[PDB]
Every structure is written in C-alpha cells, then in structure tokens.
Amino acid sequence: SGAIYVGNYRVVNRHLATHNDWANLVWEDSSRDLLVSSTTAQGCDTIARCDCQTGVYYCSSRRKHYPVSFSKPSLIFVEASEYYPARYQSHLMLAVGHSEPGDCGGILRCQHGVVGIVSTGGNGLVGFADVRDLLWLDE
Numbered sequence: 435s436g437a438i439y440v441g442n443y444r445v446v447n448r449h450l451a452t453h454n455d456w457a458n459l460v461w462e463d464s465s466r467d468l469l470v471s472s473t474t475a476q477g478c479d480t481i482a483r484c485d486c487q488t489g490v491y492y493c494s495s496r497r498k499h500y501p502v503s504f505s506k507p508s509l510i511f512v513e514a515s516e517y518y519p520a521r522y523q524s525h526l527m528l529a530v531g532h533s534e535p536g537d538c539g540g541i542l543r544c545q546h547g548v549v550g551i552v553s554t555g556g557n558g559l560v561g562f563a564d565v566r567d568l569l570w571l572d573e
C-alpha cells in the first residue's frame with residue numbers, strides 16, 4: 435500500500451483505490467494502474483519533472499529502501515491477476531529488484547522528487563507507474 439499527496443490530490447494504484455477514492459474521483463486510467471482522488475488537506479510531496487533513470491524505492495516486504503537503475507516509461511506486457519486480464523500497461527518503468535504484491539504503492543524518488551509508485555513485479559524485476567508527465571498535479 436501507499437499513496438502520493440500533492441496539493442489537493444491523492445495518487446494511488448487504481449487496483450487498491452477505496453470507496454472514498456472513487457466517490458471523490460478526479461481521474462483514473464486502467465491502462466496505467468493509476469487513480470487520483472481529491473483531498474480536503476494540502477499535500478506537500480514534490481513531483482519530479484525530469485528524465486532521470488536512477489532513483490531509490492521503498493520496499494515494504496523488506497522494510498528497506500533500495501537504489502535502482504530503471505527503464506524509460508513504456509508499454510509493457512503484464513500477466514493476468516484478480517484485478518486485470520493479461521494486457522499491456524502503459525507509462526511503466528522496470529528495474530532489477532525485489533517486490534511482492536503488497537509492495538504496490540511504495541514511492542520511487544530521484545534527486546528532483548517523486549517519480550512514481552510500485553505497480554508490478556515478478557522474476558526479480560519491479561515495475562513503477564510513472565507520474566512525471568501529469569503536469570496538472572501541481573495546479
């Protein structure tokens with residue numbers, strides 16, 4: 435689990451969104467595994483606006499942060515689960531690293547700020563849903 439709080443927005447994995455997230459929906463995209471809902475309180479996370487390919491992610495299944503090299507956002511094939519059929523997930527970045535399903539929502543950060551959140555994994559590869567292109571999160 436985990437979310438990004440910026441301004442009056444909350445960014446979470448769409449497959450983990452709550453009833454309150456859907457009742458205050460701003461935007462959602464199944465192909466990206468993202469959902470953004472509105473909040474009453476002000477968020478202070480900084481979103482990175484860059485093309486960094488190195489960062490640090492939080493892995494809850496190890497209670498540790500790991501430094502990683504990651505690919506540019508792209509369309510990557512993702513196996514079926516209880517939340518989605520087998521499909522291509524867009525805006526996804528992969529890195530060599532550990533993850534388990536409950537790790538979804540852990541933040542990936544670079545020197546400029548928040549890059550994305552853990553969204554997929556398997557075979558020693560972890561995938562992050564990019565949020566750097568969502569320029570509207572700041573206004």
Ligand SMILES: CSc1ncccc1CC(=O)N1CCC[C@H](C(N)=O)C1
Pocket residue numbers: 449467512515517518523533534535536537538552553554555556
């Ligand atoms: C960190 S997730 C993970 N990690 C290791 C093994 C397995 C997983 C689980 C996983 O990949 N997904 C299940 C939940 C939805 C995901 C999606 N975006 O389609 C796919």
Ligand SMILES: [Zn+2]
Pocket residue numbers: 482483484485486544545546547
């Ligand atoms: Zn950066």
